[PDB]
Amino acid sequence: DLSPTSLREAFGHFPSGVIAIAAEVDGTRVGLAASTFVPVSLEPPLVAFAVQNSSTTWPKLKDLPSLGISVLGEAHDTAARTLAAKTGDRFAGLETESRDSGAVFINGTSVWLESAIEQLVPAGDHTIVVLRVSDIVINEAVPPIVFHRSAFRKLGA
Amino acid sequence: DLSPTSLREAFGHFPSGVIAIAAEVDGTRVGLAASTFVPVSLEPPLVAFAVQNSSTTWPKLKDLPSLGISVLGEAHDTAARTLAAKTGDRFAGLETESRDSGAVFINGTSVWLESAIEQLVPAGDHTIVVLRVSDIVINEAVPPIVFHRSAFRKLG
Ligand SMILES: Cc1cc2nc3c(=O)[nH]c(=O)nc-3n(C[C@H](O)[C@H](O)[C@H](O)COP(=O)(O)O)c2cc1C
Ligand SMILES: Cc1cc2nc3c(=O)[nH]c(=O)nc-3n(C[C@H](O)[C@H](O)[C@H](O)COP(=O)(O)O)c2cc1C
């Protein structure tokens, strides 16, 4: 069928990394997890992800000047679920860095990308958010987590 | 450093699966490998990927009625490379099925997703292609290939 649960299950067979998208307002960290990160363009540098239109967190991020994207590492399985929590501290047991731009990054992750919204494209029950990348940090020693079939896996062979 | 080479390096640290996007035109299969597949919407059912604007294959696919997407499995490292090859038979070595709609699928993959173009969103040197899913089949729980840092990896 093309029902939401059946679609969700089928989509889950396609593996992908997971990001934290986060920023700080008045010293308070605001963020969410997304499995829909896409590296889009090199010139100019663009990325994208898809946000649920019903999100109550996204309205608190979308007007901020800069957002931090962190590609979660293979030990951040609990962190990924925690960043998705409806209630509770989404940054529990995490170490983070807040840049002067307000972008927030998670320490110990594979990649940090500082980003700014370029376009918002309505897409069914989500919105595709296209962002410009303004800064990059790579941590070569941290392999990434992979979200697949509802679970969090590490790369092997 | 925000040069193309620096971005390629950084972007390569993001792991993702690889899909075959394929169709048959006048008896000849046409396709490419993409690692930028993302699920977009459940209601209505939408997915997307990012296509290079300079692609010479995409113009052969973009006006077709229906495209086949197959998620590549861990045995398909060779298949992914071949489906990306700038010359030669991109389907060499593969078992495929072609539907009456023209959509083409790879046998031995976990999921077959049939779809048609919904929107084309310019995005720098790529275009984000939003597709409306018309049919989806889970064939079996075949473990996927993962593209990461220019290598084809399996899940541990
Ligand atoms: C592994 C995983 C991947 C997720 N991917 C997305 C996503 O790509 N887009 C999205 O809007 N929410 C995604 N979520 C949901 C959020 O992270 C979070 O649960 C949601 O934003 C919370 O509701 P709120 O924004 O109304 O506070 C994901 C959650 C998990 C656990
Ligand atoms: C693992 C892998 C992932 C790829 N992902 C994409 C992609 O997401 N988008 C894209 O336009 N090309 C992608 N390519 C490139 C194509 O598969 C192919 O090499 C290209 O379309 C060939 O050039 P042509 O379209 O001018 O024939 C990928 C190639 C490989 C090996």
Contact with chain A for residue B41, Cβ under 8 A:
yes
Q: Are B147 and B35 in contact (CB under 8 A)?
A: yes
Q: Is the peptide bond before A44 cis (omega within 30 degrees of 0)?
A: yes
Cβ–Cβ of B123/A9 closer than 8 Å? no
Cis peptide before A65 (omega within 30 of 0): no
Tokens representing residue A112 in the block: 């940090």
3-state secondary structure A34-97: ECCCEEEECCCCEEEEEEECCCCCHHHHCCCCCEEEEECECCCHHHHHHCCCCCCCCCCCCCEE
Q: Does A36 sit within 8 Å of B39, measured CB to CB?
A: yes
For residue A125, give its domain range.
1-157
CA distance B86 to B52: 14
Q: Are strands A96-98 and A104-106 parallel, antiparallel or unpaired?
A: antiparallel
Length of chain A: 157
Provide, as residue numbers in chain A, all residues whose Cβ is less than 8 Å from the Cβ of B137.
10
Cα(A79)–Cα(A22) distance, integer angstroms: 13
CATH number, domain with residue B66 = 2.30.110.10
Cβ–ligand 1 distance for A22 under 6 Å, the answer no
Instruction: Determine if ligand 2 sits within 6 Å of the CB of residue B149.
Output: no
* Whole-number Cα distances in Å, B43 to A79, A87, B46, B132: 28, 25, 8, 10
Count CA within 13 A, CB hemisphere, residue B91: 17
Laid out side by side, the sheet with A111-123 consists of: A28-34, A19-25, A67-71, A111-123, A126-138, A46-52, A38-41
Q: Which residue of A has its CA nearest to B77?
A: A157
| Beta-ladder partners of B19 | B34, B71
List the determination method: X-ray
- Structural domain tally of chain A? 1
**Exposure string over A51-81, b if 16+ CB within 10 A, otherwise e:** bbeeeebbeebeebebbbbbbbbbebbebbe
B30, containing H or E segment? strand B28-34
Interface of B with A in 109-138 (CB under 8 A): 110-111, 113, 119, 121, 123-126, 128, 130, 133, 135-138
| Beta partners for residue A54, in sequence order | none
User: What tokens does A1 get?
Assistant: 């069928």
DSSP 3-state of B150: coil
CB proximity list for B68: less than 8 A, separation 6 or greater:
B20, B21, B22, B23, B99, B103, B104, B105, B112, B113, B114
Of A123, A98, A95, residue with least CA distance to A109: A95
